[PDB]
Amino acid sequence: SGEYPTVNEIPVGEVRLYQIADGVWSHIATQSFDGAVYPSNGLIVRDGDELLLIDTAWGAKNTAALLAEIEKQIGLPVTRAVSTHFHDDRVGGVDVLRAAGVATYASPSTRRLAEAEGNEIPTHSLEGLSSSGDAVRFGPVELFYPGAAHSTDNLVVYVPSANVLYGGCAVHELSSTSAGNVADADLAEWPTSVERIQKHYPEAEVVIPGHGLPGGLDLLQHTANVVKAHKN
Numbered sequence: 001s002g003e004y005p006t007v008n009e010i011p012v013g014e015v016r017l018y019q020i021a022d023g024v025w026s027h028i029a030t031q032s033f034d035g036a037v038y039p040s041n042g043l044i045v046r047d048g049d050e051l052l053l054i055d056t057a058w059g060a061k062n063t064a065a066l067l068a069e070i071e072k073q074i075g076l077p078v079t080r081a082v083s084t085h086f087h088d089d090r091v092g093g094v095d096v097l098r099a100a101g102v103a104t105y106a107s108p109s110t111r112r113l114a115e116a117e118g119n120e121i122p123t124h125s126l127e128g129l130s131s132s133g134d135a136v137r138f139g140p141v142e143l144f145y146p147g148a149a150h151s152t153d154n155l156v157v158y159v160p161s162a163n164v165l166y167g168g169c170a171v172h173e174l175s176s177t178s179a180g181n182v183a184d185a186d187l188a189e190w191p192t193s194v195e196r197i198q199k200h201y202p203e204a205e206v207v208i209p210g211h212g213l214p215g216g217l218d219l220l221q222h223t224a225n226v227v228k229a230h231k232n
């Protein structure tokens with residue numbers, strides 16, 4: 001009823017949307033992994049009379065449910081999607097999207113990692129993002145490669161009309177004590193990558209993590225802190 005939806009409030013298979021700003025929503029879904037349930041976020045950005053989707057809802061059935069929830073709540077077609085790294089909470093559902101007519105995109109690095117690891121593979125390669133600090137425009141957003149962090153390929157997304165920074169899994173929520181799933185992370189470079197985000201987006205008003213509650217710029221420093229302490 002208006003609060004940001006949480007893991008115990010979303011059954012696995014259902015999707016909720018949350019209005020972040022004019023023409024900007026997050027999507028929230030839940031999924032089981034290794035016998036525990038987790039929430040995860042993505043983004044939806046209005047692109048004239050179409051929508052740009054950032055990240056799947058972590059699985060085929062969740063992503064079908066996402067499309068249905070978008071049709072119910074917004075009613076504009078999703079025409080393009082960008083996945084911000086190669087893990088299943090970002091690309092699982094790309095096959096559903098592609099069969100629904102959504103053009104799916106990711107960096108060449110994400111596409112190679114998804115293919116190698118057996119995850120679903122976005123169709124189109126996003127060039128111009130291979131060096132840390134690179135940025136490219138994609139409809140109503142800017143895509144930014146901050147360097148290795150949660151994964152070597154992680155991208156962040158900025159919505160300049162609303163000063164919304166979607167950090168994806170390179171950014172953790174304020175209540176997080178841990179650095180999340182660090183299986184493919186670079187803990188040594190992660191703080192440097194966060195510093196690049198902080199320098200590049202000093203006017204961000206909302207910061208959205210890949211999992212958990214949005215907040216303000218403090219999520220960036222908090223992420224650096226928790227990663228450094230995990231490494232320690």
Ligand SMILES: C[C@@H](CN)C[C@@H]1CN([C@@H](C)c2cccc3c(-c4cn[nH]c4)c(C(=O)O)[nH]c23)C(=O)O1
Binds near residue numbers: 088180181182183211
């Ligand atoms: C694990 C590798 C295969 N050996 C590929 C994995 C799986 N996976 C993704 C799909 C994943 C699964 C479960 C939990 C989390 C979290 C998290 C966040 N708070 N607590 C845990 C995170 C994150 O922090 O983004 N992501 C997760 C991921 O990230 O690595």
Ligand SMILES: [Zn+2]
Binds near residue numbers: 085089169
């Ligand atoms: Zn991940």
Ligand SMILES: [Zn+2]
Binds near residue numbers: 087169210211
């Ligand atoms: Zn994640």
